[PDB]
Each structure stands twice: as C-alpha cells, then as structure tokens.
Design a protein around this nucleic acid. Sequence first.
RNA 1: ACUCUGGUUUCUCUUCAGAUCGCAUAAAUCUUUCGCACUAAAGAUUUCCGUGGAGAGGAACAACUCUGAGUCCAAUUUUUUGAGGCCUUGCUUUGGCAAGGCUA
Length: 33
Amino acid sequence: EKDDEEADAIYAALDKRMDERRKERREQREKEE
RNA sequence: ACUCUGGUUUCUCUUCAGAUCGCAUAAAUCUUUCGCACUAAAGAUUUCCGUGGAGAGGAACAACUCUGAGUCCAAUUUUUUGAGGCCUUGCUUUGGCAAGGCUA
C-alpha cells in the first residue's frame, strides 16, 4: 500500500544508511576478492 | 601598571582515522593445518557494540582568570671626565691631518 511502500522506502534508506559505515572499503575489498 | 582576540555547554551533519582508534574485547564467512572442531590453532574478509581528529551548521550563557598580542644608578670597573695647552717632521685639502717629544 501507499503507507506500506513509504515505510519500505524509509526502512531501506535506514538500512543503506548503516552499511555506509564501511561501504566504500567493504565494496572495494569485495570487488578485489 | 592601559586596550584587543580566543570561550564553555548542547544538538545535528560531513570526512579521515592500524592510534591500547577500546587500559575493553563479540559474532559470521572463506582458506590452511592437523585432529577424527564448542570442548583447536593459524591467515584473511565482513558485520556489529562505540570512540578519536578535522570541518560545517544550529542554540544556551560567560564574556577578559587564563592563552597570548597590541602597550629607584655623580666619588675607581663602562653613562656625570685628566679633560685641555706647547714643540718637530711628511703632506698642506694653508683648515690642519699623521707620528713622536712635552706642560698640566
């Protein structure tokens, strides 16, 4: 639903906010590995 | 001994951090080793608990402590006198200079 989709977008933004802590280095190591 | 910066507290955001980033110490995955892997070790990657540095914004009272900066000597030994005057020679830039001999 509209509220449900807004909530899912908000929570996805929350989750992507968090791995940003090591996002650059984690993604670089994963690409190298 | 006169004037001027810089504050501190709190909330949020951005970046770097191998520094006991933490006087503490978790979990997962992969590899290797041997056992035969909770009762085991090594290496690597990740995630989490949560920190320092710098920068940026917001909002609350302290504003010159501190950090800095700009702002009483006359008696030996130094700054309260042994100072001034005469003579010769070389050159006179004819003012006298240079050395020596003197008198005080």
